[PDB]
Amino acid sequence: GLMQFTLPVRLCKEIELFHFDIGPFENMWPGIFVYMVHRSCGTSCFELEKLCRFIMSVKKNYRRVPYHNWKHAVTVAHCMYAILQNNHTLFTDLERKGLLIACLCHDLDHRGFSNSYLQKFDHPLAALYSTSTMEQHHFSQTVSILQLEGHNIFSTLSSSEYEQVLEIIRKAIIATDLALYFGNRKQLEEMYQTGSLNLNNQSHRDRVIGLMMTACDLCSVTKLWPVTKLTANDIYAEFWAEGDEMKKLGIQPIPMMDRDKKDEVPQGQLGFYNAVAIPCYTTLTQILPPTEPLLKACRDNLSQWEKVIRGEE
Ligand SMILES: Cn1cc(-c2ccccc2)nc1COc1ncc(C2CC2)nc1C(=O)N[C@H]1CCOC1
Numbered sequence: 127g128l129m130q131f132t133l134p135v136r137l138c139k140e141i142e143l144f145h146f147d148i149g150p151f152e153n154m155w156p157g158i159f160v161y162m163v164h165r166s167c168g169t170s171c172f173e174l175e176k177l178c179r180f181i182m183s184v185k186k187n188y189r190r191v192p193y194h195n196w197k198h199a200v201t202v203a204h205c206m207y208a209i210l211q212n213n214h215t216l217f218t219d220l221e222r223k224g225l226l227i228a229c230l231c232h233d234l235d236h237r238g239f240s241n242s243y244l245q246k247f248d249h250p251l252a253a254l255y256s257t258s259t260m261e262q263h264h265f266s267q268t269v270s271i272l273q274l275e276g277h278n279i280f281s282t283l284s285s286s287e288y289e290q291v292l293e294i295i296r297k298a299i300i301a302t303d304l305a306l307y308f309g310n311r312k313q314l315e316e317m318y319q320t321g322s323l324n325l326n327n328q329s330h331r332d333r334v335i336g337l338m339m340t341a342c343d344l345c346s347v348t349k350l351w352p353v354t355k356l357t358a359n360d361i362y363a364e365f366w367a368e369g370d371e372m373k374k375l376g377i378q379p380i381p382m383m384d385r386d387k388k389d390e391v392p393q394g395q396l397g398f399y400n401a402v403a404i405p406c407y408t409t410l411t412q413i414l415p416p417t418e419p420l421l422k423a424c425r426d427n428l429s430q431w432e433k434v435i436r437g438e439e
């Protein structure tokens with residue numbers, strides 16, 4: 127109870143910033159996550175014995191794939207931490223409990239393939255879940271791990287609070303389906319501009335949390351350039367593996383996933399920043415002003431990809 131997690135000074139300071147990199151020492155990521163829960167939620171939110179056991183079962187159920195791995199889980203949870211800390215009073219005790227856990231669990235048992243590849247492969251998961259295939263699986267895996275003996279980190283919640291938190295976590299994890307992002311941002315855009323957005327309306331909160339989840343999930347584009355650039359390699363390593371698999375099914379993959387079209391990556395980053403990232407962080411800043419640093423950092427990396435195209439790097 128009187129046991130706080132502390133970090134080294136540089137991590138203590140840098141962890142509060144949106145652009146924080148959790149570093150290459152895997153064995154520190156659990157301590158980093160617990161540190162964030164304790165400062166975001168309270169030392170009382172979770173029974174430390176159960177939290178630690180939940181974290182290590184979650185870690186175990188992430189795979190050794192190049193991008194959608196344990197490091198991504200913790201990076202995405204750190205971005206959510208940054209948002210919750212910079213927007214203290216806007217979120218319930220239950221939302222702070224659910225969203226950090228949601229973020230850690232959001233890509234559980236990811237195989238490094240898109241929903242599209244599961245469907246064209248005719249993977250069993252694509253029959254069980256017709257849309258947001260991987261995302262419903264990630265939630266299913268979260269509920270599985272929550273029901274392991276000793277793993278129920280929400281045991282102190284009432285029946286109805288327990289259901290509220292598993293419902294926050296489910297919508298939060300479904301929202302990481304980037305196909306659901308576009309519509310969700312347009313609705314939030316229209317709602318903000320007409321002045322109809324209302325954070326006491328539960329369906330409005332849901333949309334806002336969904337946008338945060340997109341924001342944290344894409345947060346690789348909000349890092350300092352050398353981090354963003356090096357993460358790009360891991361991202362394309364999955365994309366190109368999937369393209370390879372598409373070719374094995376007899377299907378020309380989209381260029382994004384075709385390793386024969388590496389040359390076009392810088393232009394592909396531009397599209398993604400303009401079509402997805404910038405709109406995402408723009409709308410998020412409108413709703414949550416203190417998240418502006420994510421927009422600024424995103425715009426900085428757009429400018430850096432523009433420099434790559436111009437042959438200046
Ligand atoms: C869009 N596009 C298109 C070409 C592209 C490249 C070469 C030739 C042609 C096109 N390259 C890109 C770049 O795509 C990304 N770049 C960076 C990141 C960061 C946030 C994680 N995510 C994505 C991305 O698409 N993330 C989506 C899809 C899977 O999970 C969610």
Ligand SMILES: [Mg+2]
Pocket residue numbers: 232233260302303
């Ligand atoms: Mg995902």
Ligand SMILES: [Zn+2]
Pocket residue numbers: 198202232233302343
């Ligand atoms: Zn993700």
